[PDB]
């Protein structure tokens, strides 16, 4: 069939959707987690890619965060997938660590990263408070959540994430409507 709504990627330089590669800026770059057996008690921390550090958040009273150290993270760098336990119970939502996975017309599942032994490092990423400090966008791709860079992130800066059209409720309400197809060029 046609690509599903979550079979599209987004080119942050063109500001439009594409399928395999942007004709001007190429396929995106996916960063792989460090390998760790699922179920391992400090797996989340251990999965962290090289170049990043977990540490106290620059956002006050917000526990831990994830910070860039090695070098400049470029635009259209993709992290993930967000790992965790898969659940249809509503109890998982708003425990702090669950993302919505859209499975149909307003139909959902949760990926619950609370349990450290099942999650990955992305559970430690805090949310942006405003568009200006936001440097990651959470979105659904292949029934999974990824975070992509929407700014160049210099060494020393915290990864801060939020979402929009391509995630959760907005994605579920419009599901099947082929709306990204319209926004290619
Ligand atoms: C998988 O982790 C998740 C998933 C999630 O929602 C699906 C929310 C959170 C989450 N963690 O903390 C918070 N709150 C802190 C206080 N508070 C500031 C907010 C977070 C940021 N919000 C916005 C709104 C508009 N534009 C931007 C840039 C950000 C406002 C509510 C709520 N929310 C974490
Ligand atoms: C996915 S976690 C982020 C990692 C978390 N800081 C930790 O130490 O486990 C989400 C939780 O962190 C806290 N948090 C994340 N972003 C925040 C923000 N912008 N302001 C206040 N608290 C935040 C909230 O308690 C939320 O339930
Ligand atoms: Zn492009």
Residue numbers in the entry: 195 to 379
Original paper wording:
PRDM (PRDI-BF1 and RIZ homology domain containing) proteins comprise a distinct branch of known and putative protein lysine methyltransferases (PKMTs). All PRDMs contain an N-terminal PR domain that shares the canonical SET domain methyltransferase fold, but with only 20–30% amino acid sequence identity.
To better understand the molecular interaction between PRDM9 and MRK-740 and mechanism of inhibition, we determined the crystal structure of the PRDM9 catalytic domain (residues 195–385) in a ternary complex with SAM and MRK-740 at 2.58 Å resolution. An analysis of the intermolecular contacts revealed a network of largely hydrophobic interactions between PRDM9 side chains and MRK-740. Additionally, the pyridine ring of MRK-740 forms a π-stacking interaction with W356. Significant additional interactions were observed between the adenosine moiety of SAM and the two central rings of MRK-740. The binding position of the substrate lysine is sterically occluded by both methoxy groups of the MRK-740 benzene ring. Taken together, the structural data are consistent with our biochemical results indicating a SAM-dependent, peptide-competitive mechanism of action (MOA) for MRK-740.
